[PDB]
Write an enzyme that holds these catalytic residues in place. Structure first.
Site, PDB file in Angstrom:
ATOM      1  N   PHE A  83      -8.908   4.825   3.005  1.00  0.00           N
ATOM      2  CA  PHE A  83      -8.596   3.965   4.180  1.00  0.00           C
ATOM      3  C   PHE A  83      -9.831   3.171   4.616  1.00  0.00           C
ATOM      4  O   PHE A  83      -9.862   2.624   5.747  1.00  0.00           O
ATOM      5  CB  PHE A  83      -8.031   4.836   5.304  1.00  0.00           C
ATOM      6  CG  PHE A  83      -6.684   5.410   4.961  1.00  0.00           C
ATOM      7  CD1 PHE A  83      -5.559   4.605   4.880  1.00  0.00           C
ATOM      8  CD2 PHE A  83      -6.543   6.760   4.691  1.00  0.00           C
ATOM      9  CE1 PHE A  83      -4.308   5.150   4.612  1.00  0.00           C
ATOM     10  CE2 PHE A  83      -5.301   7.294   4.382  1.00  0.00           C
ATOM     11  CZ  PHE A  83      -4.193   6.489   4.321  1.00  0.00           C
ATOM     12  N   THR A 106       0.850  -1.219   0.000  1.00  0.00           N
ATOM     13  CA  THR A 106       0.000   0.000   0.000  1.00  0.00           C
ATOM     14  C   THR A 106       0.871   1.249   0.000  1.00  0.00           C
ATOM     15  O   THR A 106       0.655   2.114  -0.884  1.00  0.00           O
ATOM     16  CB  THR A 106      -0.983   0.014   1.171  1.00  0.00           C
ATOM     17  OG1 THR A 106      -0.195  -0.123   2.344  1.00  0.00           O
ATOM     18  CG2 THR A 106      -1.981  -1.115   1.148  1.00  0.00           C
ATOM     19  N   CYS A 123      -8.653   1.479   7.987  1.00  0.00           N
ATOM     20  CA  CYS A 123      -7.237   1.099   8.128  1.00  0.00           C
ATOM     21  C   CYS A 123      -6.690   1.453   9.519  1.00  0.00           C
ATOM     22  O   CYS A 123      -6.664   2.625   9.863  1.00  0.00           O
ATOM     23  CB  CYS A 123      -6.417   1.814   7.063  1.00  0.00           C
ATOM     24  SG  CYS A 123      -4.671   1.352   7.062  1.00  0.00           S
TER      25      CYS A 123
HETATM   26  C1  LIG Z   1      -3.715  -8.507   3.916  1.00  0.00           C
HETATM   27  C2  LIG Z   1      -3.847  -7.394   2.871  1.00  0.00           C
HETATM   28  C3  LIG Z   1      -3.262  -6.075   3.399  1.00  0.00           C
HETATM   29  C4  LIG Z   1      -3.440  -4.839   2.509  1.00  0.00           C
HETATM   30  C5  LIG Z   1      -4.041  -5.063   1.114  1.00  0.00           C
HETATM   31  C6  LIG Z   1      -5.015  -3.954   0.745  1.00  0.00           C
HETATM   32  C7  LIG Z   1      -5.682  -4.155  -0.610  1.00  0.00           C
HETATM   33  C8  LIG Z   1      -6.962  -4.985  -0.554  1.00  0.00           C
HETATM   34  C9  LIG Z   1      -7.863  -4.642  -1.713  1.00  0.00           C
HETATM   35  C10 LIG Z   1      -8.637  -5.812  -2.303  1.00  0.00           C
HETATM   36  C11 LIG Z   1      -9.366  -5.260  -3.514  1.00  0.00           C
HETATM   37  C12 LIG Z   1     -10.286  -6.243  -4.187  1.00  0.00           C
HETATM   38  O1  LIG Z   1     -11.089  -6.940  -3.606  1.00  0.00           O
HETATM   39  N1  LIG Z   1     -10.134  -6.214  -5.545  1.00  0.00           N
HETATM   40  C13 LIG Z   1     -10.887  -7.000  -6.464  1.00  0.00           C
HETATM   41  C14 LIG Z   1     -12.129  -6.285  -7.017  1.00  0.00           C
HETATM   42  C15 LIG Z   1     -12.348  -7.107  -8.279  1.00  0.00           C
HETATM   43  O2  LIG Z   1     -11.045  -7.440  -8.731  1.00  0.00           O
HETATM   44  C16 LIG Z   1     -10.146  -7.189  -7.784  1.00  0.00           C
HETATM   45  O3  LIG Z   1      -8.966  -7.114  -7.980  1.00  0.00           O
END
Ligand SMILES: CCCCCCCCCCCC(=O)N[C@H]1CCOC1=O
Ligand SMILES: CCCCCCCCCCCC(=O)N[C@H]1CCOC1=O
Lengths: 454, 455
Positions: B393, B268, B400
């Site tokens: 966030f 991030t 977050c």
């Molecule tokens: C353990 C993870 C810590 C931090 C990660 C933060 C990012 C999470 C975002 C997930 C986003 C997410 O769910 N994206 C999907 C939507 C459809 O296609 C995708 O790629």
């Protein structure tokens, strides 16, 4: 007048197959132990006489009778090092010109100017080791190569190899090491034209292009910027030989940069690796050196004057050079018909090889304990007979980098011993890799921080 | 008033699933939102979710009385290695509130003052790397920002040095973590996840999980055995007691928290710093204003905690980079009860919503017609921003926990970069966004010219 001994022969190949080993110098040392102070070594089309005693080497070091020879090894290195200082004949105009221009860059006085840049790289090594996690180890020769290459790159040419930002070797260093290895490999080839070596020769020409491309760019970039850095490259671009009044031409400058990068890194990295090896195998000596580093280096950054006070660290480095001089042989030719040691008649042009590690094991000089690591042998340097200790070669063809190397190695080993305790956690068995230069291979240690801030 | 919501193009039995057959699914969903508007249905075999893009609808979705955090399909796959860590736990799981209560004080000002020293350690390594480049050389921006943010969380998380600036190829642990994350995102487009074609992918995944667990569990066991107290999250987690249950976290949950934090730092904050530097070199008036602030405030060789809090304009730059390219680009919600969204869309209990943050942040009804312009001055008066218009966030009690941490790190690092170097967009770089869990610029290179200010 005596006939000199000769090691075992292989019919028409004479002694040549004795070099068919990845450790030829160690093989020649074992031959010297068996045959003594002098032996004949014959290959198709060449003869040389290997000397191991101070009695004979003190005569070979008489510059009125003998001059530096390009050994078969140096003739192969000349394919990439040209008429640089290391691979030029004394009688070539470019030897004396480069020697006169560069000598003042390499005096004990000049070391005051390089000091700050040596500290820059030394601090990077200490920071690397401070940043290791519990149960991680140090690859000693790998890190010493990172240090010595970066030091000569920065001090010499104001060029940052940034070796400590890479866990795989710098592409330039891959080519340098392979070029050196090919030079050593050419020595043992009964048939150099065997198609088996065509790939080796193609790789050699590729490695030469890699080295030339980088060096020629550095020279062109400095010329274009007009920058005055008071570094070796500045001295070589601006410097005039007091004798001829001539500057070096751009081609010779390229060979000098290649020469300095290779010799500068290979020899000094070997020294630091052998020094650390001997310290962890002789913990009483490690303790004496560590006590001196702790007492003398009282400031976060060592000063030039503090490095000159590291007397015992300097003795440790001299005793590592005694046992494993990292450029382990030099070659001489007879200037005229002469008799060596009142016993061996030589003709004009006859080749001698000084086997430095065997010289340094001469019991008539050092006593019976010649295999022991005892820096105290150097506590009174004046006590050492003439021509008994020759890790930097001889006379006007002696190492130009001697002060540079010993200042760097003293500063670095001092900082290492100030900042860390060392553990021989694998009970490492010494394995000496040969690439014309000598270095420990596979040597690992654990360092425990004494937690002293920079 | 009740409306049918639009739906993007379908592929017979596979419904919308093949739209995710791309290495840029978020960018694909943004283009769908531009065409279909504020809400669209997205169907795959055996699942439906509704993608929201307007502040009008997202402000309703952020109502905690009606909607709770959902584990999207992506988070369900990540839960195979992040377990019931803070990110991949349901709000109603005992270990969410327990870990939340124990870890909140690990992001207090006192804790942040301790993390600051470790952040500076890594930030100085980045500045030294760039000071040591030769004249002909360029910076690989997202590569160096990832080296920085991973090393920062490794030091702040468990006093562990990845030593990313000593390496060209990643630490073996990070190879496994990145491949595990890639496998999680690749599973999203698989029509038949049971196809024997994916046997190799599954074997590699289990190997990668073992690598991550083995390292983390060893560090926890080593710390417990030594009894050593550090300024790190691991110390806080080994000593902390939940005031509600009175319980500490168990060693397994601590491992999931460490993995969660490491994934967050790698993914991030590195994205944010890379996008921030992209926008600064494309908007030199903004770069100059930020550099003048850095020069005025950062008067010491090493920035202090208090000095970083004075970099107000650098903070606005980072918020405006998060507006245009929020690096964590979506969060998911489920309906707590049958309800009507926006007076038009009836939802059943359990129905899933996806908040498409980059589209929300382009709502012209909120930001005006200049919505694609990089204007940090939008954040001079944050009270002007309508409810739930700016959500980089996430939302509510599931927002977050590392927001302060990440913005402190990014402000410190961007401040030091602007103090120490002038930057040149020497390739006239065309923005290319790589997608993993998060969004990052790909192939972004610059040249730095040192202002020659000592550390
Ligand atoms: C353990 C993870 C810590 C931090 C990660 C933060 C990012 C999470 C975002 C997930 C986003 C997410 O769910 N994206 C999907 C939507 C459809 O296609 C995708 O790629
Ligand atoms: C560019 C400058 C080159 C720097 C490194 C040169 C070191 C040369 C030492 C050569 C010693 C040498 O000649 N070794 C030979 C003797 C037979 O087997 C060998 O290996």
């Amino acid at each position: 007048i005596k006939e000199m001994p000769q090691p075992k022969t292989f019919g028409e190949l004479k002694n040549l197959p004795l070099l068919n080993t990845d450790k030829p110098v160690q093989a020649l040392m074992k031959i010297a132990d068996e045959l003594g102070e002098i032996f004949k070594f014959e290959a198709p089309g060449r003869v040389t006489r290997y000397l191991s005693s101070q009695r004979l080497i003190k005569e070979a070091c008489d510059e009125s009778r003998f001059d530096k020879n390009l050994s078969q090894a140096l003739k192969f290195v000349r394919d990439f090092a040209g008429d640089g200082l290391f691979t030029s004949w004394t009688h070539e105009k470019n030897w004396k010109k480069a020697h006169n221009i560069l000598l003042p860059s390499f005096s004990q006085q000049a070391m005051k100017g390089y000091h700050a840049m040596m500290v820059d790289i030394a601090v990077q090594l200490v920071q690397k080791w401070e940043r290791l996690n519990a149960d991680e180890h140090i690859e000693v020769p790998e890190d010493m190569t990172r240090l010595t290459l970066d030091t000569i790159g920065l001090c010499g040419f104001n060029y940052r190899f940034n070796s400590f930002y890479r866990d795989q070797p710098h592409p330039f260093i891959t080519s340098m090491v392979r070029a050196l290895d090919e030079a050593m490999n050419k020595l043992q080839r009964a048939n150099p034209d065997d198609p088996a070596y065509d790939e080796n020769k193609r790789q050699f020409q590729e490695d030469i292009k890699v080295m030339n491309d980088l060096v020629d760019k550095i020279i062109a970039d400095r010329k274009a910027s007009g920058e005055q850095s008071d570094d070796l490259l500045t001295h070589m671009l601006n410097g005039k030989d007091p004798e001829t009044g001539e500057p070096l031409d751009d081609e010779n400058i390229r060979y000098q940069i290649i020469t300095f990068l290779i010799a500068g890194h290979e020899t000094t990295s070997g020294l630091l690796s052998f020094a650390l090896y001997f310290l962890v195998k002789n913990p009483h000596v490690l303790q004496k050196a560590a006590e001196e580093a702790a007492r003398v280096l009282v400031d976060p950054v060592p000063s030039y004057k503090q490095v000159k006070q590291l007397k015992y660290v300097g003795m440790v480095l001299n005793e590592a050079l005694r046992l494993w001089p990292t450029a382990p042989a030099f070659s001489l030719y007879a200037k005229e018909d002469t008799v060596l040691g009142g016993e061996y008649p030589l003709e004009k042009g006859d080749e001698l090889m000084v086997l430095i590690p065997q010289l340094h094991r001469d019991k008539t000089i050092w006593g019976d304990d010649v295999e022991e690591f005892r820096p105290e042998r150097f506590e009174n340097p004046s006590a050492i007979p003439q021509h008994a200790f020759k890790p930097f070669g001889n006379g006007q063809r002696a190492c130009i980098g001697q002060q540079f190397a010993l200042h760097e190695a003293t500063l670095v080993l001092g900082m290492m011993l100030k900042h860390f305790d060392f553990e021989d956690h694998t009970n490492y068995e010494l394995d000496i890799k040969e690439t014309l230069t000598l270095k420990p291979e596979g040597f690992v240690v654990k360092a425990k921080s004494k937690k002293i801030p920079l």
